[PDB]
Symmetry: C2
Subunit: 232 residues, 2 copies
């Protein structure tokens, strides 16, 4: 008896959403106008507030990066699923920034307020970062944890039977621009080999061409690292 709107542009969250839908039933699964998921219906949130409010009991977003209209937040219960450990490295690509700065990463399910990845926490779970992890390998585990956490908490999210708690501090927020500035490797920058290995593995995600430098002759060169722990 609970009508749920799911919104996500993320491929892994969408696969999760499709499974929740097969199990729950009264749930629609949409992406935004800029989403790139083929065959997934599209919802322009800013233009659909009264419709969403009239039709749904709960809006459940995954990996949302754009703030919801105040009227939406007020008109219906809005919950977001974020693949970082709030309030640390809120925003873009939490694992990239955690690999670099040592703070916790994980998955957080929280009530939505007017700030990004901010607001009362319903549940969260940490994900360990190993010395040999890259962004891509942490991200993969984060997607498993996300599925594990959401499935465990689904009934309480659907029913509203939790007591959510705001984090104790504001933490820190990373935006797209903070990621873009990390991508560029300054060949002149001094630091430890550990620091440099952290930077390269933080920027390594499957075959994405994230990290780049410009060489002594003006040519752009992309870089990633392959890290392999000795078997125990």
């Amino acid at each position: 008896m609970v009508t749920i709107l799911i919104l996500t542009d993320n491929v892994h969250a969408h696969a999760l959403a499709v499974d929740l839908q097969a199990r729950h039933g009264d749930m629609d699964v949409y992406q935004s106008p800029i989403g790139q998921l083929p065959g997934v219906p599209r919802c322009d949130v800013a233009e659909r507030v009264a419709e969403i409010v009239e039709r749904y009991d709960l809006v459940l977003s995954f990996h949302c990066k754009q703030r919801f209209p105040a009227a939406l937040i007020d008109g219906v219960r809005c919950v977001n699923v974020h693949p970082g450990f709030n309030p640390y490295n809120r925003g873009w690509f939490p694992q990239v920034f955690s690999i670099i700065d040592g703070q916790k990463v994980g998955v957080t399910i929280h009530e939505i307020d007017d700030q990004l990845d901010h607001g009362p926490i319903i549940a969260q779970r940490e994900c360990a970062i190993e010395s040999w992890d890259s962004s891509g390998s942490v991200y993969a585990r984060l997607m498993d944890i996300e599925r594990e956490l959401v499935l465990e908490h689904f009934d309480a999210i659907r029913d509203g039977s939790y007591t959510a708690k705001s984090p104790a501090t504001e933490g820190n927020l990373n935006l797209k621009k903070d990621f873009e500035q990390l991508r560029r490797l300054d060949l002149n920058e001094r630091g430890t080999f550990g620091h440099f290995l952290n930077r390269l593995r933080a920027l390594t995600h499957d075959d994405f061409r994230n990290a780049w430098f410009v060489d002594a002759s003006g040519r752009k060169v992309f870089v990633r690292v392959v890290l392999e722990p000795e078997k125990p």
Copy 2:
């Protein structure tokens, strides 16, 4: 009429030798007692000096790492093919060391004397090192260049009709221990990002596990780098 002994332990130099033998005829191809080339006959050079000297007119080695017996050098004309640009980064894995120090790398065909990769140069050719090269990618090009250069100068080497010239300087020599020392990445070591990238690419060679660090829990982790230049606009 020139009877040649080729010695090499290297798999690419050996394929080159077999091609030379097909064209030359009067040529035997051997590896050392420690070579790992399957089906390649073995020659213990130190134990075989008198035999080599009587049977052959030229000894031509490729990538030779053990100094030749003095009586051998004196008894028969000996020439080596070394995949570095003498006199710079002589010895082990020149492209590794040149990726790090910016010195020239290449292939050098030289007369053998009593030091490693030292002795009058018959011919050499440089191999450019790109910012995106690894040891592995430079090494593959060095093997092409080696075949190019040796084929070009083979008749002259065979006939002894060249005039070899000693390099003007001693340059420098790397041994196996110098390579092994590079392998351990100290996480506390300080340097530029450029220097560190040079270190990782120098230690990247196909899938060999050359570079490693130990993390704070004592776990050993191996490291390779993948570099790819932005593709030029379509030609």
